[PDB]
Amino acid sequence: PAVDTAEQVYISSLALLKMLKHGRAGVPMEVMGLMLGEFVDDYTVRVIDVFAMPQSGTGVSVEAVDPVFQAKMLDMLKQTGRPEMVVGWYHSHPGFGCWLSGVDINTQQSFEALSERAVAVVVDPIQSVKGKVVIDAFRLINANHEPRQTTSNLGHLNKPSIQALIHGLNRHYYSITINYRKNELEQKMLLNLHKKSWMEGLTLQDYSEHCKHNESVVKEMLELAKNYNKAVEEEDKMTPEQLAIKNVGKQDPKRHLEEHVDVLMTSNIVQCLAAMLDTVVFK
Amino acid sequence: ENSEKIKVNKTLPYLVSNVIELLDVDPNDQEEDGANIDLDSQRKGKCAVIKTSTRQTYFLPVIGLVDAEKLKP
Amino acid sequence: QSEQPLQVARCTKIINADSEDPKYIINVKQFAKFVVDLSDQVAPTDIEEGMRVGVDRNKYQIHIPLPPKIDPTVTMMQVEEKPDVTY
Numbered sequence A: 001p002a003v004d005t006a007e008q009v010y011i012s013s014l015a016l017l018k019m020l021k022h023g024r025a026g027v028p029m030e031v032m033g034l035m036l037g038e039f040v041d042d043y044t045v046r047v048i049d050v051f052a053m054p055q056s057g058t059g060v061s062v063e064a065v066d067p068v069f070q071a072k073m074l075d076m077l078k079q080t081g082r083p084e085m086v087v088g089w090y091h092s093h094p095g096f097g098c099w100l101s102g103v104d105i106n107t108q109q110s111f112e113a114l115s116e117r118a119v120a121v122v123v124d125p126i127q128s129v130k131g132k133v134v135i136d137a138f139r140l141i142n143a144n145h146e147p148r149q150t151t152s153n154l155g156h157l158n159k160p161s162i163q164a165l166i167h168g169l170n171r172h173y174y175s176i177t178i179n180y181r182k183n184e185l186e187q188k189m190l191l192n193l194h195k196k197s198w199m200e201g202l203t204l205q206d207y208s209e210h211c212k213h214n215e216s217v218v219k220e221m222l223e224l225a226k227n228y229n230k231a232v233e234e235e236d237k238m239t240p241e242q243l244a245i246k247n248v249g250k251q252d253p254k255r256h257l258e259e260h261v262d263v264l265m266t267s268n269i270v271q272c273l274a275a276m277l278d279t280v281v282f283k
Numbered sequence B: 001e002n003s004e005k006i007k008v009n010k011t012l013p014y015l016v017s018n019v020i021e022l023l024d025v026d027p028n029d030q031e032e033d034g035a036n037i038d039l040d041s042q043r044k045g046k047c048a049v050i051k052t053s054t055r056q057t058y059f060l061p062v063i064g065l066v067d068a069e070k071l072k073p
Numbered sequence C: 001q002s003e004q005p006l007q008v009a010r011c012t013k014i015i016n017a018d019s020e021d022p023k024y025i026i027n028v029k030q031f032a033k034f035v036v037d038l039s040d041q042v043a044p045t046d047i048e049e050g051m052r053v054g055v056d057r058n059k060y061q062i063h064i065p066l067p068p069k070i071d072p073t074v075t076m077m078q079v080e081e082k083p084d085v086t087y
């Protein structure tokens, strides 16, 4: 009779990627799907996979068109080794942040009536960037007191967003921490994704193109050095405040010289070292 | 019940507008399920472009409660 | 007690009255045009076509008829105070 705040929803890498891909595909709509998983203990709701369902709607609503597909998909996944059953649903809010609306709350009410601990996950594709993905998990609060019991600090570590608070967080629903537990093979595959072929490492680079690039950058550095000489004469006839706005709309010879130096050093050192390594390795 | 719903959704304050056009639109190609929109496709009738008195133009995939053939630019 | 109970009405000009049932087209100056209904205080006979009516900011329903707009240069022709001369 508690539902604790240390409860977490474990989203697999596959589930997260599927959710984000479907949401981004349906950028103007709130495309939606089901989440399969297990209810391990009272402190874990494991989400292992998600599958989209046939649905149609406008930019103001989206609804599913057939339940036969859902039943058949559950059966045909069980037949291949995924006996997990639905533990919630996911739908995308493209740019509105993460929260539930009235229709979302009604759907979550139906899911709660079916299974007590069902959860809803809102993933916002467009606001997601490379480093971070905007995603949250929710569950409803009855018409009562405090919705949950706190036996740790784990719940109060997220600082709920102003948009979610405006749209009803901690009043009509509460959030659940999302965790990304992975297995060894998932970790290894994610690390190996970006690994390149071995031959690419030792492959050299056309010397004509390399010399042309070096020549171009040195020619640019010449003019940058002229401008740097001009700029050094300043910085004494400049107000302490005026210096900051001095480099607004105007080139910075020092910064550009540093960048060009870095690129030239990297390219030339790499090429020379690769040349020597090949010279020894290949007879 | 449906008539009651229509009446309650027809709340009196309207915004006068002029019908700029009555375009004819047709579906383009197959739309993948999971993400298919009833407006961009699956709409074969007549669509209206209107200009509200607030100087705001709008496209109406569904004309509304007035039959299309009656409206003229 | 004047800012609490007395709301803010907006000047508009009625253009058409539709059907026997009250349905009025108004043209709020430089704001918009609406098809609006009356308030319980104002009787239908009070509102005619072409007269100025104040409308609330929420539902844009008529609340009070207003005097016709008149040029200042023609309204200043009225005598107001009459001369003291006699026959």
Ligand SMILES: [Zn+2]
Binding pocket: A030, A091, A093, A099, A100, A101, A104
């Ligand atoms: Zn929603």
